[PDB]
Design an enzyme around this catalytic site. Structure first.
Site, PDB file in Angstrom:
ATOM      1  N   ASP A   1     -25.677   0.675   4.031  1.00 11.53           N
ATOM      2  CA  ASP A   1     -24.732   0.200   3.012  1.00 11.53           C
ATOM      3  C   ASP A   1     -24.733   1.106   1.776  1.00 11.53           C
ATOM      4  O   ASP A   1     -23.680   1.342   1.175  1.00 11.53           O
ATOM      5  CB  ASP A   1     -25.064  -1.241   2.563  1.00 11.53           C
ATOM      6  CG  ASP A   1     -24.373  -2.347   3.386  1.00 11.53           C
ATOM      7  OD1 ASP A   1     -23.762  -2.100   4.442  1.00 11.53           O
ATOM      8  OD2 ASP A   1     -24.471  -3.529   2.953  1.00 11.53           O
TER       9      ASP A   1
ATOM     10  N   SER B   1     -13.967   3.648   5.399  1.00  7.15           N
ATOM     11  CA  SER B   1     -13.122   2.764   4.592  1.00  7.15           C
ATOM     12  C   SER B   1     -11.986   3.540   3.905  1.00  7.15           C
ATOM     13  O   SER B   1     -10.810   3.202   4.079  1.00  7.15           O
ATOM     14  CB  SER B   1     -13.970   1.990   3.568  1.00  7.15           C
ATOM     15  OG  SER B   1     -13.172   0.947   2.981  1.00  7.15           O
ATOM     16  N   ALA B   2     -12.304   4.620   3.163  1.00  6.23           N
ATOM     17  CA  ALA B   2     -11.245   5.425   2.527  1.00  6.23           C
ATOM     18  C   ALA B   2     -10.779   6.605   3.370  1.00  6.23           C
ATOM     19  O   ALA B   2      -9.695   7.156   3.105  1.00  6.23           O
ATOM     20  CB  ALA B   2     -11.706   5.957   1.164  1.00  6.23           C
TER      21      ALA B   2
ATOM     22  N   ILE C   1     -12.472   9.621   3.706  1.00  9.39           N
ATOM     23  CA  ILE C   1     -12.783  10.915   3.084  1.00  9.39           C
ATOM     24  C   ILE C   1     -14.275  11.225   3.037  1.00  9.39           C
ATOM     25  O   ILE C   1     -14.667  12.398   3.039  1.00  9.39           O
ATOM     26  CB  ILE C   1     -12.164  11.009   1.665  1.00  9.39           C
ATOM     27  CG1 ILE C   1     -12.689   9.929   0.714  1.00  9.39           C
ATOM     28  CG2 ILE C   1     -10.651  10.956   1.751  1.00  9.39           C
ATOM     29  CD1 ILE C   1     -12.220  10.096  -0.741  1.00  9.39           C
TER      30      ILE C   1
ATOM     31  N   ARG D   1     -17.778   9.546   4.733  1.00  7.03           N
ATOM     32  CA  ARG D   1     -18.364   9.660   6.076  1.00  7.03           C
ATOM     33  C   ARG D   1     -17.451  10.437   7.021  1.00  7.03           C
ATOM     34  O   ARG D   1     -17.926  11.238   7.840  1.00  7.03           O
ATOM     35  CB  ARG D   1     -18.647   8.268   6.656  1.00  7.03           C
ATOM     36  CG  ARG D   1     -19.646   7.474   5.836  1.00  7.03           C
ATOM     37  CD  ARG D   1     -19.771   6.031   6.301  1.00  7.03           C
ATOM     38  NE  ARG D   1     -20.376   5.209   5.252  1.00  7.03           N
ATOM     39  CZ  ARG D   1     -20.576   3.898   5.349  1.00  7.03           C
ATOM     40  NH1 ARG D   1     -20.210   3.253   6.450  1.00  7.03           N
ATOM     41  NH2 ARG D   1     -21.125   3.231   4.331  1.00  7.03           N
ATOM     42  N   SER D   2     -16.143  10.168   6.963  1.00  4.38           N
ATOM     43  CA  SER D   2     -15.184  10.868   7.835  1.00  4.38           C
ATOM     44  C   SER D   2     -15.225  12.383   7.606  1.00  4.38           C
ATOM     45  O   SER D   2     -15.126  13.174   8.557  1.00  4.38           O
ATOM     46  CB  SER D   2     -13.760  10.348   7.584  1.00  4.38           C
ATOM     47  OG  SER D   2     -13.568   8.999   8.050  1.00  4.38           O
TER      48      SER D   2
ATOM     49  N   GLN E   1     -17.832  12.677  -0.635  1.00  8.90           N
ATOM     50  CA  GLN E   1     -17.643  11.877  -1.859  1.00  8.90           C
ATOM     51  C   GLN E   1     -18.792  11.954  -2.861  1.00  8.90           C
ATOM     52  O   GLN E   1     -18.606  11.531  -4.018  1.00  8.90           O
ATOM     53  CB  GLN E   1     -17.462  10.394  -1.498  1.00  8.90           C
ATOM     54  CG  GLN E   1     -16.109  10.032  -0.950  1.00  8.90           C
ATOM     55  CD  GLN E   1     -16.022   8.545  -0.556  1.00  8.90           C
ATOM     56  OE1 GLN E   1     -16.681   8.080   0.385  1.00  8.90           O
ATOM     57  NE2 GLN E   1     -15.235   7.802  -1.291  1.00  8.90           N
TER      58      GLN E   1
END
Ligand SMILES: CNC(=O)c1cc(Cl)ccn1
Ligand SMILES: CNC(=O)c1cc(Cl)ccn1
Ligand SMILES: CNC(=O)c1cc(Cl)ccn1
Length: 282
Positions: free
Chosen positions: A181, A216-217, A219, A221-222, A262
């Protein structure tokens, strides 16, 4: 500089935040006018994360062709990726329309539906074989075929049917379930094992449309996933693997979607993953 020794030099000097801020300063800035139109407000999860106009994926629809998704095309590595946000309640049908229209084989999910006590994306796939999902706005049907739950990730086989033409396709869902998390994983070993499982499936290969990858966004982890994959491929292709410059690869990818990686911790984790991965490859 090489990677592994540049790495220890940044650790010993404690300058990860300064390196990361340099990247943020040099990153491309391109317009995202379609994302900001008033009619698209409920199609964006975060007001400060938008696809650039020049690289956005267009839905094959004449009413509204907008989805928060970008095509990352890596020319030397010969790899393409679609990076997108976690689907919203009013965009799950658009998400699967994109998968269909772009001829993708695989979807890579790097978040849990609930994290930190809040919803990070919609429950956009079926959880039981006998309870399929119908998306009436885009005329698609989605069925769970099988599910394999492992200690760090789950793989699902899904059937996507275009109800207009009765054509069907098999989609593979690769779900990394153990990213913490807060922060980043202590070791990159399970993330690398996961990347190799996606590779072995064919989902990243040129005989299919681009893989769809999200968190989630779409940018952070992706960005870590595609940056590690591309750097390892270049190290295999080139005569001199120590010439691969992870900061330069990241800036190239940021020409196609804003904000990739990020935090300085995500940057350090990306270095660690590429370093350890390069030893296993040989
Ligand atoms: C770096 N990758 C390549 O050069 C390559 C070559 C082929 Cl045939 C397919 C995919 N990738
Ligand atoms: C053939 N397997 C690999 O190349 C591999 C590479 C890494 Cl880094 C982890 C797991 N598998
Ligand atoms: C020094 N060599 C490497 O770093 C390397 C890395 C990879 Cl991925 C393949 C071959 N060589």
């Amino acid at each position: 500089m090489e990677m592994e020794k540049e790495f220890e030099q940044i650790d010993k000097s404690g300058s990860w935040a300064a390196i990361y801020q340099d990247i943020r300063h040099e990153a491309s800035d391109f317009p995202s006018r379609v994302a900001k139109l008033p009619k698209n407000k409920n199609r964006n999860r975060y007001r400060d994360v938008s696809p650039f106009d020049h690289s956005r994926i267009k839905l094959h629809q004449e009413d509204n062709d907008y989805i928060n998704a970008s095509l990352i095309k890596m020319e030397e590595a010969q790899r393409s990726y679609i990076l997108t946000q976690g689907p919203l309640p009013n965009t799950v049908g658009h998400f699967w329309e994109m998968v269909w229209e772009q001829k993708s084989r695989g979807v890579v999910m790097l978040n849990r539906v609930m994290e930190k006590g809040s919803l990070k994306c919609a429950q956009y796939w079926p959880q039981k074989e006998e309870k399929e999902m119908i998306f009436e706005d885009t005329n698609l049907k989605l069925t769970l075929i099988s599910e394999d739950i492992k200690s760090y990730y789950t793989v699902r086989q899904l059937e996507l049917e275009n109800l207009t033409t009765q054509e069907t396709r098999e989609i593979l869902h690769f779900h990394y379930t153990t990213w913490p998390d807060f922060g980043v994983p202590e070791s990159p070993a399970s993330f690398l094992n996961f990347l190799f499982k996606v590779r072995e499936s064919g989902s990243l290969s040129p005989e299919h449309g681009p893989v769809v990858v999200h968190c989630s966004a779409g940018i952070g982890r992706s960005g870590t996933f595609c940056l590690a994959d591309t750097c390892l491929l270049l190290m295999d292709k080139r005569k001199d693997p120590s010439s691969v410059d992870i900061k330069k690869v990241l800036l190239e990818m940021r020409k196609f979607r804003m904000g990739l990686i990020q935090t300085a911790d995500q940057l350090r984790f990306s270095y660690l993953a590429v370093i350890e991965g390069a030893k296993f490859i040989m």
